[PDB]
Amino acid sequence: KVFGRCELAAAMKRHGLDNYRGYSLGNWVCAAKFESNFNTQATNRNTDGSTDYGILQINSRWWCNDGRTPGSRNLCNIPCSALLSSDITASVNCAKKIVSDGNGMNAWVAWRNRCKGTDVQAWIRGCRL
Ligand SMILES: [Cl-]
Ligand SMILES: [Cl-]
Ligand SMILES: [Cl-]
Ligand SMILES: [Cl-]
Ligand SMILES: [Cl-]
Ligand code: NA
DSSP string, 20-68: BTTB-HHHHHHHHHHHHTTBTT-EEE-TTS-EEETTTTEETTTT-B-S-
52 catalytically annotated: yes
- For 54, residues 6+ apart whose C-beta sits below 8 A from its C-beta are 36, 40, 41, 42, 43, 83, 84, 85, 91
Residue range(s) defining the domain that contains residue 59? 1-129
How were these coordinates obtained? Answer: X-ray
Q: How many domains does the chain have?
A: 1
Give the resolution value in Å.
1.5
Give the torsion through C-alpha atoms of 87, 92, 97, 100, to 10 deg.
180
Residue 107 C-alpha from the chain's centroid: 10
Distance (angstroms) between ligand 2 centre and the Cα of 127 equals 34
Cβ neighbour number for residue 95 with a 10 Å cutoff: 29
Say which CATH number the domain at 76 has.
1.10.530.10
Distance (angstroms) between ligand 2 centre and the Cα of 121 equals 34
35 catalytically annotated: yes
Strand partners, 39: 2
